[PDB]
Design a protein around this ligand. Structure first.
Ligand code: HEM
Ligand code: HEM
Lengths: 727, 727
């Protein structure tokens, strides 16, 4: 019975459509022609559905899937009902342990390709040829919250990429800020317990704004650098497409001659950098907790494929000790003003998964998964990471055969003498399960290291020292990097940093914790320290006002690449506008609006005070995407109000509020014809104001003004005007 | 090191304190003297900390917990560092699968006591004497969301009680609505999959507002009854303390004479019934995803112990077929106007756990866990539940010995011949591990059924019919209960239901699903259906307008017990008021305000534009709990603005917004003296309006008027006035 509508509107068209135009769907159904070698190898396990009989897991067709088997229709359920018991058993056992950290994350498939061969600095096969494509799977995530926590919380973001290379899987497991909070892996559990929900009551979810986090931070000043990044707008990116990615650690590149070059990995978002503002981001955790997940998935369904440029910071082995910070300390960044990022390749994510659980939830990334041509360093954080990912995956994924879970399998050959383990898929036919063996003529065999297709050999780094549990003295500097970061931010970015700390610390119950954090800020920058103190009603002592600021980092008083916005990099393709309709829309305005949006690849969402349709003045029937309250201004990049019967919406509280919120959150607003009467709601200017586009009608000029504002992301100059507004 | 403040302010006092006054803490440190038998029996596994050396799990003291062992202070981490490896290993394996459903929950310890012996109707030992105290552990929960999802989502709530009786554990696993969505347990995986995040992209979290839910509901009209309850304000309770609880299924009570009586279990909230309004709930999911968890914990830390009355709907075996609905159908309620709830006992929750993971996360509740004196019925949803809880716990809790996890252990004796299994704690000394045996003289032995302390014997219900997979034809009625519920609601409740369906259907992307649900609403009630259809821009057809309304339920055209608010039952103790300060508060107003709240057990939170202190007009120093933006109006029940230097906050956007939000969400507001300048902000006439308390000062009847308003929970008369207002 219960079947599809006659018109076939239950099923999404298999072509790129704008967000909200069609029901989203499994990637292989939405984009059947989008392929890559990894995507294709997953076909052995894909399972369709159309035209097949419903069955048990043993293949027995089910006749009645609505009822348990009972002795009489009002009788007891019988134990012999094996259909019911398999069905309920499988349901009872759906859940697997979520990731210890980064449990909340969203992933997609794609491909990578280098711009040119890097064979002079590395023998890694995936970086050796500009026309040799490597399939990728990328998972972006938050850090602290559970798998069901919200996307747009304040947090560091993970950015993990699995490269299915010809010589093995390479996972580049990084974050959206260039440093981590702590120096040695031994303190990981300590840092993570402090930022996670407090042990007695398991509060708060997905947030650092609570006593144990600020306690830990105040007692461990090595965390201040990453805490500055987290409190800036870097902790609340607008989308996974508009954030940077970094491997943080110094790794090594090894070429065919055996030369080692120190390397730091970067991803540059080709959609530019952009973040939300705090109030918007926190409200968005309530209006749409899956905002980033949704936005990623929709951009891929729309053809706005997230694109990132892989880049390398390269430091010759002889310059190991030439900075004023240790290269092996993960709480220290390498300023691009000192070591520029060399462009290496492009990564495009062009296909969503079919099943979230099977591919996203069971994906396993590990910074230890390297290939010939790459090698580690002694960074003490990285070092302990090599132990942990392998270990956690044995319980998370139920045993040691997690490499056999479809998303995790290499697409290149894998042969060895490992056998058995829970849920073993691979049936080995080798007569031998050990080497050396003569009965299989010693196959599979070891392969010497060499220029290409060779066996892995570690770089022979010289090791000299006593066995000690000791932090390197060169790691003992905690304030100059925080200060460099502060000084490179724009004034409005600095304010947002002050506000992040003031908000967070105001949720710290124990007041001495607040004071101690303020004291640490005083070691970074007195202006910052005083601005946070003032918000906390704290007064800096005379001693605190005399703390000398830390030294510059190798002569640097600022580095503009550390700011999200000092260097313009705005891109409107893939952004979205809210269009507030009225019941007699002036079609001429809409037409002009939609044409200019379409030329720049900007999407639109048609909003009204009810769902269904409204008819424009020329008879055009406009389907309503959502209501004013149901898809808040939080979810769009700018707002446009066309003319028409404005009296229909002029007194609407949600419509008025829509604009006050957009205004407060510094988004571009454009008002045509009688829509300019809404200017009194956002109680400001009569001759106009930068950030508000206005005209008798929506024209070419009106739309260029709006699109230019959109390209600068937000109206920073409006900051001074928003704190009187009641929104 | 000795890191605590010398003042001792890192430590909350071990005495009842109001919410926000001190840092919250593990139950046994916060209320050491609050004991019960179960709480005392857990003392064997409680672990302290103070004054102990830091060790490995094997008892080896640790010297340096800040660093890994390496070959040189900048060298590689050594494999021999067993301290690092045990520490990271335990951390790496901290997580366990979350519950398949009801993963998000909050729990507490308490005790139960019956009002009088129920021996005439049940031989259940915990109900046989009013001086017999049974320890309980209760967990309240949402349904769909992960363990990290938000508290205040729209959803049914779970209400599970573990009774540690002298004759066994009895778990009463119910919800906050008297019926469930589906009739037979075979469809649980289908219903649950439909309500959970859609499989391709795992969106949306914690919400039924999406296509698959509404698709399922529109094809399975048996769900409408519970969908009505979920769409009403029942789905967004103000707190776990202000909601009702139900067992849902008909069970049996068996007395010593062998007589079976049918029973439905109810829990009445002694704090009264209270819910939020949708906008507030939704916004609260972002501002504080742990609002319910927090309120429960702080209520118990303040002495506002959540209290519930256990009540029984009793129906003689002879009346099984006397109703319009089948008693064994879980989608049907038993109208209290037909069968009154008989008061049975009182449950008081008076202590939080010590460790959320250990006690809450690992608690295992199961409706099949009954004791002599109770028995099941053939309700087909219940019948399948009896299989599921046992099964799911083998994987969630790691094996068949989950009854040995401290929180789950019986306080009464348990002895049998079961052995081994993962994580086996009990070391059995019985020479025999089988019965009958002669080698231990057959111990432990079976015990015949009897009036007290006898063995379990099922009631000998007659069974008759063929082995069939068949829904009873008596279950095929889907619309009269939904209609009864609808007609029992106040007019503002009906509107809220209409708004729930409207908002939810507005997030369904496929319009035909919205149409199909509207067609189903039209079989319940025309006014409901038309109002929802209008909100969706849908017109009912002439046939839909002529669908005949379903019959009354046994002559009833309404039952006021089904409404949250038709019959006042307001209780103010434990509610919280926001006090908006200024920098020279009339201290006379504040003294009047604070004393009056305290007299009724009403808590207060002093708010301002910054943290720190402000000084009242007489020099009283006032400590600030949070900012206007930091503890939004969503988290209080009422707002009071005292006189002083109102010009200080008159133009504060946040202060103004605070009132707008509280006014929009129907909360009582009280403005003293010059605080009445805020009337313009919320458009209050000069003459005033019901719901707004205003006077020249906070003396006389000012606090009595505000407290009368708090007792009625919200100002429903204000609904029409909020329609407009931009907030
Ligand atoms: C620079 C420092 C670090 C970065 C950039 C980082 C990044 C990440 C990312 C992006 C993920 C999620 C991968 C996914 O999407 O599945 C992750 C997970 C994880 N991280 Fe790291 N992390 C860092 C430090 C550490 C440390 C020091 C440890 C422990 C010694 C650690 C242990 C883990 C574990 C156990 C997981 C879960 C892996 C799984 O369950 O498969 N992380 N980390
Ligand atoms: C009258 C209908 C139902 C009610 C009132 C109900 C209530 C609940 C509650 C309150 C919980 C959470 C317990 C806790 O806090 O740990 C729960 C969990 C659960 N429910 Fe039920 N449920 C119902 C129907 C069902 C059905 C039909 C099934 C499957 C046949 C089912 C399977 C489960 C499972 C597997 C869990 C997780 C338990 C665990 O992991 O320990 N429920 N249910």
């Amino acid at each position: 019975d219960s079947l599809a509508p006659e018109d076939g509107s239950h099923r999404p068209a298999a072509e790129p459509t704008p967000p909200g135009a069609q029901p989203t769907a499994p990637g292989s159904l939405k984009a059947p022609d989008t392929r890559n070698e990894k995507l294709n190898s997953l076909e052995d396990v894909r399972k369709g559905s159309e035209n097949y009989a419903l069955t048990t897991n043993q293949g027995v067709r089910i006749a009645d899937d609505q009822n348990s088997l009972r002795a009489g229709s009002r009788g007891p359920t019988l134990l012999e009902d094996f259909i019911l018991r398999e069905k309920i058993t499988h349901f009872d056992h759906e859940r697997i342990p979520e990731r210890i950290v980064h449990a909340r994350g969203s992933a997609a498939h794609g491909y990578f390709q280098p711009y040119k061969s890097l064979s002079d600095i590395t023998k890694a096969d995936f970086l050796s040829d500009p026309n040799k494509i490597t399939p990728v799977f990328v998972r972006f995530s938050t850090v602290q919250g559970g798998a069901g926590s919200a996307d747009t919380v304040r947090s560091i973001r993970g950015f993990a990429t699995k490269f299915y290379t010809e010589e093995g899987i390479f996972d580049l497991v990084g974050n959206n800020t260039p440093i981590f909070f702590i120096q040695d892996a031994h303190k990981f559990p300590d840092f993570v317990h402090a930022v996670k929900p407090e042990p007695h009551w398991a509060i708060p979810q997905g947030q650092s704004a609570h006593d144990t986090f600020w306690d830990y931070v105040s007692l461990q000043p090595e965390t201040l650098h990453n805490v500055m990044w987290a409190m800036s707008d870097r902790g609340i990116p607008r989308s996974y497409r508009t954030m940077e990615g970094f491997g943080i650690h110094t790794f090594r590149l090894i070429n065919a001659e055996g030369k080692a070059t120190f390397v730091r990995f970067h991803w540059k978002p080709l959609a530019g950098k952009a973040s939300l503002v705090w109030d918007e981001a926190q409200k968005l955790t309530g209006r749409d907790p899956d905002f980033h997940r949704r936005e990623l998935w929709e951009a891929i369904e729309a053809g706005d494929f997230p694109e990132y440029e892989l880049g390398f910071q390269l430091i010759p082995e002889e310059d190991e000790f030439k900075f004023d910070f240790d290269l092996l300390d993960p709480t220290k960044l390498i300023p691009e003003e000192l070591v520029p990022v060399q462009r290496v390749g492009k990564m495009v994510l062009n296909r969503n998964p079919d099943n979230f659980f099977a591919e996203n939830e069971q994906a396993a990334f590990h910074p230890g998964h390297i290939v010939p041509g790459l090698d580690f360093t002694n960074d003490p954080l990285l070092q302990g990471r090599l132990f942990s990912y392998t270990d956690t995956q044995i319980s998370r994924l139920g045993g040691p055969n997690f490499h056999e879970i479809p998303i995790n399998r290499p697409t290149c050959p894998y042969h060895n003498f490992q056998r058995d383990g829970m849920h073993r898929m691979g049936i080995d036919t080798n007569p031998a399960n050990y080497e050396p063996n003569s009965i299989n003529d010693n196959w599979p065999r070891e392969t010497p290291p060499g220029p290409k297709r060779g066996g892995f050999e570690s770089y022979q780094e010289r090791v000299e020292g006593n066995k000690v549990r000791e932090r390197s003295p060169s790691f003992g500097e905690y304030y100059s990097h925080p200060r460099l970061f502060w000084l490179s931010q724009t004034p409005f970015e600095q304010r947002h940093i002050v506000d992040g700390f003031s908000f967070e610390l105001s949720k710290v119950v124990r007041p001495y914790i607040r004071e101690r954090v303020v004291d640490q800020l005083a070691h970074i920058d007195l202006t910052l320290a005083q601005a946070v103190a003032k918000n906390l009603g704290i007064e800096l002592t005379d001693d605190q006002l005399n703390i000398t600021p830390p030294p510059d980092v190798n002569g640097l008083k600022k580095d503009p690449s550390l700011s999200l916005y000092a260097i313009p990099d705005g891109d409107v393709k893939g952004r979205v506008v809210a269009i507030l309709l009225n019941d007699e829309v002036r079609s001429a305005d809409l037409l002009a609006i939609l044409k200019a949006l379409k030329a720049k690849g900007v999407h639109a969402k048609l909003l009204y005070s009810r769902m269904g349709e409204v008819t424009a003045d020329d008879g055009t029937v406009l389907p309503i995407a959502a209501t004013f309250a149901g898809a808040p201004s939080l979810t769009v990049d700018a707002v446009i109000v066309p003319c028409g019967n404005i009296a229909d919406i002029a007194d609407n509280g949600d419509a008025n509020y829509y604009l006050m919120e957009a205004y407060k959150h510094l988004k571009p607003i454009a008002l045509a014809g009688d829509a300019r009467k809404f200017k009194a709601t956002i109680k400001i200017a009569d001759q106009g104001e930068e950030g508000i586009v206005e005209a008798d009608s929506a024209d070419g000029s009106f739309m260029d003004e709006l699109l230019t504002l959109m390209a600068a992301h937000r109206v920073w100059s409006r900051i001074p005007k928003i704190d009187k507004i009641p929104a």
